[PDB]
Design a protein around this nucleic acid. Structure first.
Ligand SMILES: Nc1ncnc2c1ncn2[C@@H]1O[C@H](C[C@@H](N)CC[C@H](N)C(=O)O)[C@@H](O)[C@H]1O
Ligand SMILES: Nc1ncnc2c1ncn2[C@@H]1O[C@H](C[C@@H](N)CC[C@H](N)C(=O)O)[C@@H](O)[C@H]1O
Ligand SMILES: OC[C@H]1O[C@@](CO)(O[C@H]2O[C@H](CO)[C@@H](O)[C@H](O)[C@H]2O)[C@@H](O)[C@@H]1O
Lengths: 248, 249
DNA sequence: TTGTTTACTAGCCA
DNA sequence: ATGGCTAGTAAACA
DNA sequence: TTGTTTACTAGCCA
DNA sequence: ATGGCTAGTAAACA
């Protein structure tokens, strides 16, 4: 395991104290959504119970942010207004990013529009948070270049280097047979996590994942060169995280 | 003006008495986002608690106008969506959170954030027996995509042979100024998405309310789809365009 | 071209 | 207050 | 092929 | 407390 890469198979809430306050540049928080998934009982909480537990781990993770830190939190629309409304009292919301998973959730419903997107709250401790777009700009290919280029835009940073990813990221969910896929139920694309890691944490900086699971953020910090602290209570997920960071 | 489509050049929050309680099948509300736009008025200049109290006020007037099967779509920005949705969940139940991918991002010149190309829409319902019909809004596959999707497991399926759910993310590009449908409105919404709402959550003949009709896109939607419509808008210029868009059908 | 699957069925009736 | 039966649900990876 | 624009800069300075 | 100046921000309509 590399320098700065820390994998703790420990309950984050008990072992948060073991992490120094104001010592993490970025928190990549993909916690249980409260959707009844089989991880333990972590995602088997619903309603005000789940909201209370969410707040409980958030008040432990927030103080560990440096004055320049930022945070991305994954959630479902079913709870996003409340969790975001709470986090707006503690930090400032810089963005709401929509992961358009392209592939919709199945079930067989016809009484509503099917879920295709996940909500991501992008918060910051202060207005002097760190944000660097250049590493995450998306380049135009030759054809997309020739289409967007005009003598009003020639030389513009968005044209030559790349455009802003925007607050909706259209990336397909990892198929079970995808090369990236491992033995985790709710994996996250490396594209997404890597974008966030590059855009809000200095090189060699510290990224905390209170609910790390497969080490997706761990892999994202291994490459791109950033320090990482992870917390996953499931032994098998920590194993797969190790294998994922020990193959780069 | 056609029958069943009513256009009012007044303030909504004050004519709410006129509207009967439990008469509206569907509310399609596109309110001021609290963003500083100039609608010819200063309604979108409110921010923070001012904006949110004003929002909750007009909402407390609009909600009783929905009959039990009633539903509501509400446009908003991510800066105020958590609070607005949190309040509305105490009144009605949230069925969906639809994200309007406007495809074209907001301009300004920032490099410290992610440019906006999403608007939030809250889909709430009064009861669990709310009206909803997906078949009018199913998206049919074309001769190439259905072929790419058709497997023996899916042959004869409702979603394959007819059309799939539009999902809670609608990637409909914003209306360019030179676009044919575009009128002289600062924040015009495309006819596609409002027509989708009108077709799905309002039965043929039902009454739709747009407290902030603007250019009357909901009026055109209700006229083209055989649904009654009522609207409110203080700008007479916007109401004039709202008219013209309906008489042109 | 094809098997298969991913964080988000639901309304009745009993 | 609580299950079970039903008609039903996409895009994209290997 | 090309002009033009649409609900959402941002920090500094005199 | 107030503009102004800067360095910038894109898909898609006509
Ligand atoms: N108290 C807890 N502390 C640390 N991890 C937890 C805790 N409770 C649940 N978890 C784990 O958090 C993970 C949530 C996952 N959605 C994270 C997946 C991860 N983002 C990935 O891309 O693979 C689950 O695997 C849980 O086992
Ligand atoms: N009290 C008010 N009552 C009725 N309309 C109002 C009020 N305040 C502001 N408005 C208008 O509400 C509209 C908000 C816009 N989103 C309407 C756009 C409209 N959905 C369209 O299709 O273009 C503005 O045109 C306002 O002038
Ligand atoms: O608006 C529904 C919304 O509420 C949530 C919590 O955000 O669930 C709560 O409210 C439901 C109302 O239908 C109850 O069924 C549920 O018991 C309660 O927790 C979400 O599940 C849903 O998105």
């Amino acid at each position: 395991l590399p320098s700065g890469i820390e994998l703790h198979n420990r309950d984050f809430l008990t072992d948060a104290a073991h992490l120094p306050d104001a010592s993490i540049d970025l928190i990549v928080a993909d916690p249980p959504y409260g959707l009844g998934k089989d991880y333990n009982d972590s995602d088997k909480r619903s309603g005000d119970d789940f909201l209370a537990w969410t707040r409980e781990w958030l008040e432990l993770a927030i103080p560990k942010l440096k004055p320049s830190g930022s945070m991305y939190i994954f959630c479902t629309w079913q709870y996003a207004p409340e969790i975001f409304s709470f986090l707006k009292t503690q930090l400032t919301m810089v963005n709401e990013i929509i992961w358009d998973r392209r592939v919709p959730s199945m079930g067989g419903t016809t009484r509503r529009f099917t879920s295709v997107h996940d909500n991501i709250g992008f918060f910051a401790v202060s207005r002097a948070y760190y944000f660097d777009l250049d590493p995450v700009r998306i380049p135009y290919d030759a054809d997309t270049k020739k289409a967007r280029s005009r003598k009003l835009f020639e030389g513009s940073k968005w044209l030559e280097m790349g455009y802003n990813p925007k607050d909706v990221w259209s990336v397909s969910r990892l198929h079970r047979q995808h090369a990236e896929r491992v033995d985790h139920p709710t994996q996250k694309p490396l594209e997404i996590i890597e974008r966030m890691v590059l855009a809000s944490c200095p090189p060699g900086g510290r990224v905390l994942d209170p609910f790390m699971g497969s080490g997706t953020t761990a892999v994202a910090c291994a490459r791109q060169g950033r320090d990482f602290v992870g917390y996953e209570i499931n032994e098998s997920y920590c194993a797969i995280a190790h294998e994922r960071v020990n193959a780069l």
